């Protein structure tokens, strides 16, 4: 039978949210069901930070990361990213990590 009180995900007092598109497979999905992550990462990376500053002007410069919000589609969310599948209980747990 029913196997979530949030049903799909997060929708109480509305009836129609609005669809966004999966970043991975372009599948439409109700934004409130979407499953999202902020991709904040540095512009450079791991090792490049030394060889960066070394062959640059300015003192150490500044460094300005990238920021983009990722929308996945369940199937896509499950096939790789945040998902695993949790036990009938751990499921309920909304707390991030």
């Amino acid at each position: 039978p029913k196997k979530r009180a949030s049903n799909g995900r997060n929708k109480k007092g509305r009836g129609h949210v609005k669809p966004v598109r999966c970043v991975n497979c372009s599948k439409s999905i109700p934004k409130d069901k979407a499953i999202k992550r902020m991709a904040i990462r540095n512009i450079v990376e791991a090792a490049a930070v030394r060889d960066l500053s070394e062959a640059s002007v300015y003192p150490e410069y500044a460094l300005p990361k990238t920021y983009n919000k990722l929308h996945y589609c369940v199937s896509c969310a499950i096939h790789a990213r945040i998902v695993r599948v949790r036990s009938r209980e751990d499921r309920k747990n909304r707390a991030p990590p």
């Binding site: 300015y58 300005p64 990361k65």
Partner: protein, 214 residues
């Protein structure tokens, strides 16, 4: 059997007045031959340089600037205002969750009759001792802040061209008169003009252009 560089005319870029280094960078053209000359052809390019790269200091890392090339003289071509942008990183940082965003804009003419559109962005701030984990303005708030912001901009322009407006923006006088009137309505943080684009120049007037040079 050509290699355009063993042929390319060459050139250095000079900045205008109200900043730091009038010297900027370099370019490439094509030799001023009869039929197609290095002059009239291009020149009228534009160059985007972060003003921290042109003001020296680093309390200006954001705020990109569009300089347009109008006139030329013997390996020395001057430039005038053409716009102002923000670094993509800055915004993308500035716009955090859990808080209201507010934008607003306006079109308007200046003394030396350039026509432009400037923007403005501000976010609501938590206020030191606030318990509730988000802080949101009340829409009635947001209509008001936009109105105030709008009134403020329509004054700060048509003061002596972009010339004074350029001089106006650089020390962000506007940012804080905004901040001033604002705080009667709602907290708020950041608060900048973000962008401004040019959409109607007047005429050359080779004299007036020459006023930023010496």
């Amino acid at each position: 059997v050509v290699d355009p560089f063993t042929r390319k005319e060459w050139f250095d870029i000079k900045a205008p007045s109200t900043f730091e280094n009038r010297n900027v960078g370099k370019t490439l053209v094509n030799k001023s031959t009869g039929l197609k000359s290095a002059s009239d052809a291009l020149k009228g390019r534009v160059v985007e340089v972060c003003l921290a790269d042109l003001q020296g200091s680093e309390d200006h890392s954001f705020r990109k600037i569009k300089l347009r090339v109008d006139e030329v003289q013997g390996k020395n071509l001057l430039t005038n205002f053409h716009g102002m942008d923000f670094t993509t990183d800055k915004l993308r940082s500035m716009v955090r969750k859990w808080q209201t965003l507010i934008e607003a804009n306006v079109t308007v003419k200046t003394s030396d009759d350039y026509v432009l559109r400037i923007f403005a962005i501000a976010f609501t701030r938590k206020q030191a001792n606030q318990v509730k984990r988000h802080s949101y303005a009340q829409s009635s708030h947001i209509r008001a802040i936009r109105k105030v912001i709008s009134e403020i901009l329509t004054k700060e322009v048509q003061g002596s061209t972009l010339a004074q407006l350029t001089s106006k923006l650089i020390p962000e006088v506007i940012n804080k008169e905004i901040e001033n009137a604002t705080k009667d309505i709602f907290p708020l943080q950041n608060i900048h003009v973000r962008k401004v684009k040019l959409l109607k120049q007047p005429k050359f007037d080779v004299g007036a252009l020459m006023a930023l040079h010496g």
